């Protein structure tokens, strides 16, 4: 079912797809194995269903939350990295792609959403989240707009969500404990609410997702943006000049985005389980192989020593550092798909008024528990 | 770092067999195809067949069934042919050669005594240094499966082994000067050396790398003077 003697590789498609394809094409150029790089919609959700029967690709790259939910289905091999290999990676990415003591996908790099601005439009970007209403009445005046992010996905809504205290499985005593969950506290309200204010005193319109604020900011309509790294790489082709610093804080406290290790799973039906640590282990996970991956749509910080030491000297990699180290590295357990579907259709209905703010976190609430 | 040590030479009569040795070390030798290429003077270069060492899963050309068999040794890192039945035209410098014809060793030569076409031209060719050179190779179908064209270039200095300019149509190989320029897609294929240099006196041939028996051009010499 899976064929024997090629590798098939799925990778979201904001990320670097070409890059990693040329990477695959030196490595079928040294092996004579042939390496396809492909981007599925929603490959985080046909993945668990293709390779339930034993389907789908050889190696999957996707943030580390997901792979809990996959390890514990059976669906992820053991990954088998020697002591020499794991020396050249972060101590830290290592353990977000760890599942009862096994590690189950190599670390590429580590993400967190920042905030982007135009200096343009704006050379000194908002340090709270309070002065926005009154930033984007004035650049109205001007037919520009204050903010635009994508509102559709929970990710992009969760550092303000969680900035006054909401959080989504409480961390205590070293596990996750999953019957307490933070998506209807008094934070989460709080933060929910002031974006819908936004929305209700039209600062932000509800319908926005990824492709709408990508443009609207490259085009130069919007002043900022929250986004991570992938997307610097269209702002750089487009003309605006920019700036990536912190995200802004809201009641005084740093607005705390999840944190995600973008990582590489091998499928346990795979037939290739050993070409896939050879291109991952001496391909990828190269200073020249990253570099491929970078140059395509950047990685962010890697988790790679040697390649990161020479990407922190960028001005936008300490801001996606400092972002990351304001928030919380996700979780991989595997009640991480109910809560994203949960606080999702939470962060839509809030929006556009379809739910009130209390019963929509109060619903998100019962289906993770 | 990857070397491919095959003897320099065997001297063998008809009938009579020899089994040739190609040592791999600098890379995970279980992981890579390894072919054996055959050169013999007045016929270009013809692919015998390759084995996986992985597996020891082969493929044979089909003028090379019944006269060579492909083995691997895992544990010394050493691939061998053994050539049967063997003829005064067996007589040649055969070559191992790993992955899509990437890295070749230096060739054994053996004397005996006692569906795709790919045209290359111009078949020789002599320019001064400085000048633009273009050499062409068109392909009977196209080496196209979409990006990605199956189809390398490579230089062989008289005397050694070819050595890969340029992969998968376009993508300069590792070390290669940046004069030699790659380009074409589908079956209309080009190299250009966009200002040559006396260094670069050599055969340069096209090879597909689509299927068997990944064929080559027949060459051009090209001299410098």
């Known amino acids: 079912k899976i064929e024997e003697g090629k590798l098939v590789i799925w990778i979201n498609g904001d990320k670097g797809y070409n890059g990693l394809a040329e990477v695959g094409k030196k490595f079928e150029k040294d092996t004579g194995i042939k390496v396809t790089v492909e981007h599925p919609d929603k490959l985080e959700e046909k993945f668990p269903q293709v390779a339930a029967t034993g389907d789908g690709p050889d190696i999957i790259f996707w943030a580390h939350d997901r792979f809990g939910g996959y390890a514990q289905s059976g669906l992820l091999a053991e990954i088998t990295p020697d002591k020499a290999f794991q020396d050249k990676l972060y101590p830290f990415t290592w353990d977000a792609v760890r599942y009862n003591g096994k590690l189950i996908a190599y670390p590429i790099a580590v993400e967190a959403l920042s905030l982007i601005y135009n200096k343009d439009l704006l050379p000194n970007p908002p340090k709270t989240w309070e002065e926005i209403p009154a930033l984007d009445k004035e650049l109205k005046a001007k037919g520009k707009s204050a903010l635009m992010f994508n509102l559709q996905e929970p990710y992009f809504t969760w550092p303000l969500i969680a900035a006054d205290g909401g959080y989504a499985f409480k961390y205590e005593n070293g596990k996750y404990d999953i019957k307490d969950v933070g998506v209807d506290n008094a934070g989460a309200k709080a933060g929910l609410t002031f974006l819908v204010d936004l929305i209700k005193n039209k600062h932000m319109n509800a319908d926005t997702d990824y492709s709408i604020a990508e443009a609207a900011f490259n085009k130069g309509e919007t002043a900022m943006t929250i986004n991570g790294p992938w997307a610097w790489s269209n702002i750089d082709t487009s003309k605006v000049n920019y700036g990536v610093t912190v995200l802004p804080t809201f009641k005084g406290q740093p607005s705390k985005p999840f944190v995600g290790v973008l990582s590489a799973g091998i499928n346990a039906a795979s037939p290739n389980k050993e070409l896939a640590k050879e291109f991952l282990e001496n391909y990828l996970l190269t200073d020249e192989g990253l570099e491929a991956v970078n140059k395509d749509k950047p990685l962010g910080a890697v988790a790679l020593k040697s390649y990161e030491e020479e990407l922190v000297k960028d001005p936008r990699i300490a801001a996606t550092m400092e972002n990351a180290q304001k928030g919380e590295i996700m979780p991989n357990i595997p009640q991480m798909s109910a809560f994203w579907y949960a606080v999702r259709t939470a962060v839509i209905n809030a929006a556009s008024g379809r739910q009130t703010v209390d019963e929509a976190l109060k619903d998100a609430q019962t289906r993770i528990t | 770092q990857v070397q491919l040590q095959q003897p320099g030479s065997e001297l063998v009569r008809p009938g009579a067999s020899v089994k040739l040795s190609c040592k791999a070390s600098?890379?995970?030798?279980?992981?890579?195809?390894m072919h054996w290429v055959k050169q013999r003077p007045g016929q270009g270069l013809e692919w015998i067949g390759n084995i996986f060492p992985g597996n020891g899963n082969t493929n044979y050309d089909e003028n090379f069934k019944s006269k060579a068999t492909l083995t691997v040794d895992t544990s010394s890192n050493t691939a061998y042919m053994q050539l049967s039945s063997l003829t005064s035209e067996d007589s040649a410098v055969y070559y191992c050669?790993?992955?899509?014809?990437?890295?070749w060793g230096q060739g054994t030569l053996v004397t005996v005594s006692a569906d795709i076409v790919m045209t290359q031209s111009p078949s020789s060719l002599a320019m001064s240094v400085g000048q633009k050179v273009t050499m062409s190779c068109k392909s009977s179908q196209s080496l196209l499966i979409n990006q990605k064209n199956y189809l390398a270039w490579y230089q062989q200095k008289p005397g050694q082994s070819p050595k890969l300019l340029v992969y998968?149509?376009?993508t300069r190989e590792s070390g290669v000067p940046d004069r030699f320029i790659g380009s074409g897609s589908g079956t209309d294929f080009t190299l250009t050396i966009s200002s040559v240099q006396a260094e670069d006196l050599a055969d340069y041939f096209c090879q597909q790398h689509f299927t068997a028996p990944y064929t080559f051009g027949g060459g051009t010499k090209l001299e410098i003077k």
């Open positions: 600098g890379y995970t030798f279980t992981n890579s195809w």
């Open positions: 050669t790993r992955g899509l014809f990437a890295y």
């Open positions: 998968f149509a376009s």
